[PDB]
Design an enzyme around this catalytic site. Structure first.
Site, short mmCIF file in Angstrom:
data_model
loop_
_atom_site.label_atom_id
_atom_site.label_comp_id
_atom_site.label_asym_id
_atom_site.label_seq_id
_atom_site.Cartn_x
_atom_site.Cartn_y
_atom_site.Cartn_z
CG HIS A 52 -0.42 0.45 2.48
ND1 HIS A 52 0.09 -0.45 3.40
CD2 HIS A 52 -0.25 1.68 3.03
CE1 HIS A 52 0.53 0.21 4.46
NE2 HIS A 52 0.34 1.50 4.26
CG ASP A 97 0.10 -3.81 2.89
OD1 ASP A 97 0.49 -3.45 1.75
OD2 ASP A 97 -0.08 -3.01 3.83
N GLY A 184 3.36 6.81 8.35
CA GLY A 184 4.76 7.02 8.04
C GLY A 184 5.61 5.83 8.46
CB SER A 186 2.94 2.24 6.11
OG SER A 186 1.78 2.46 6.96
N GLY A 187 5.24 -0.12 5.98
CA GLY A 187 6.30 -0.74 5.21
C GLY A 187 7.48 -1.16 6.06
#
EC number: 3.4.21.1
Length: 236
Positions: A52, A97, A184, A186-187
Site C-alpha cells: 500500500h 500487504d 509514516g 508503514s512498510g
C-alpha cells in the site's frame, strides 16, 4: 542476517533508537526528499516494504540514515530498478500487504547497513512474545530521528475482538500496550529475536485512524508471505 554490529538498547510513545542499531531499516522518500514509508533490507539488492506504500521507480531508498535532519551522515541513496507488488495483494481488505523492491544499485553493507533475517514458513511466534518495531512515522496524532518501541504479539482470534472480520490469515496483530505504529511507519519492520537473531515477523500495514495506543496495530504476516518472497528472488 539479523545481527547488528551496533547492538540495540531497549511510532506513538516510542523512544529514540541507538544510531545504526537497526541496520536493515530504510526510508522510502519521493523525489522531493519526503519520507513516506519504511522498508527492510533482506540482502544487498532487495528491500521489502508494504504494497500500500505505492512505491514507484522514481522514489528513492535511503539506507544507513538515523537523523533525517542531519547532512553529515554517510547515507546511501539507492535507485529502484523494479517494483514487485504481490499479485495476491487485495487493496480493498489490505490483505497480503507486501511489495519487493529490486535495487538498480546494490547497497554497500557496513556497520550501519545490513540485512534482517526472514522466517521459515513454519516458524511460530506465540502471542505474548515481545518484539520490536521501528520507523520515522508520526510520534503524536514526522520525527527526524529513528524511533523504536517494544510491543507484544496478539493472537488473531483475540485481535478480532478489536477488528472483527477485517483480520485475515496473512495478518498478525501487535500492540494495544501503550505504544502504536502510526502514519509514516508503514512498510517498516516488526522484528522478534529468534535463536539470537532478529527475524522479520511483520510489516507495518494498518490500524487505528488515530493511532490509538489501546488498539492493536495490524502487520502483514511474513510467514504467510515468505514463500512468495523466495520465489521472486529466485526468478529475478
Amino acid at each position: 542476517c539479523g545481527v547488528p554490529a551496533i547492538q540495540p538498547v531497549l511510532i506513538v510513545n516510542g523512544e529514540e533508537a541507538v544510531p545504526g542499531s537497526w541496520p536493515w531499516q530504510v526510508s522510502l522518500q519521493d523525489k522531493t526528499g519526503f519520507h513516506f514509508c519504511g522498508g527492510s533490507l533482506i540482502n544487498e539488492n532487495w528491500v521489502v516494504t508494504a504494497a500500500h506504500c505505492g512505491v514507484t521507480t522514481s522514489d528513492v531508498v535511503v539506507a544507513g540514515e538515523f537523523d533525517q535532519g542531519s547532512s553529515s551522515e554517510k547515507i546511501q541513496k539507492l535507485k529502484i530498478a523494479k517494483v514487485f507488488k504481490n499479485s495476491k495483494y487485495n487493496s480493498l481488505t489490505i490483505n497480503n500487504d507486501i511489495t519487493l523492491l529490486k535495487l538498480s544499485t546494490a547497497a554497500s553493507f557496513s556497520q550501519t547497513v545490513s540485512a534482517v533475517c526472514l522466517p521459515s514458513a513454519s516458524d511460530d511466534f506465540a502471542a505474548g512474545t515481545t518484539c520490536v518495531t521501528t520507523g520515522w512515522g508520526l510520534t503524536r496524532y514526522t520525527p527526524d530521528r529513528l524511533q523504536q518501541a517494544s510491543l507484544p504479539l496478539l493472537s488473531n482470534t483475540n485481535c478480532k475482538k478489536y477488528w472483527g472480520t477485517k483480520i485475515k490469515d496473512a495478518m498478525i496483530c501487535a500492540g494495544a500496550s501503550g505504544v502504536s505504529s502510526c502514519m509514516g511507519d508503514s512498510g517498516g519492520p516488526l522484528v522478534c529475536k529468534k535463536n539470537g537473531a532478529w527475524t522479520l515477523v511483520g510489516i507495518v500495514s494498518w490500524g487505528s485512524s488515530t493511532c490509538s495506543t489501546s488498539t492493536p496495530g495490524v502487520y502483514a504476516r511474513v510467514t504467510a508471505l515468505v514463500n512468495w518472497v523466495q520465489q521472486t528472488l529466485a526468478a529475478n
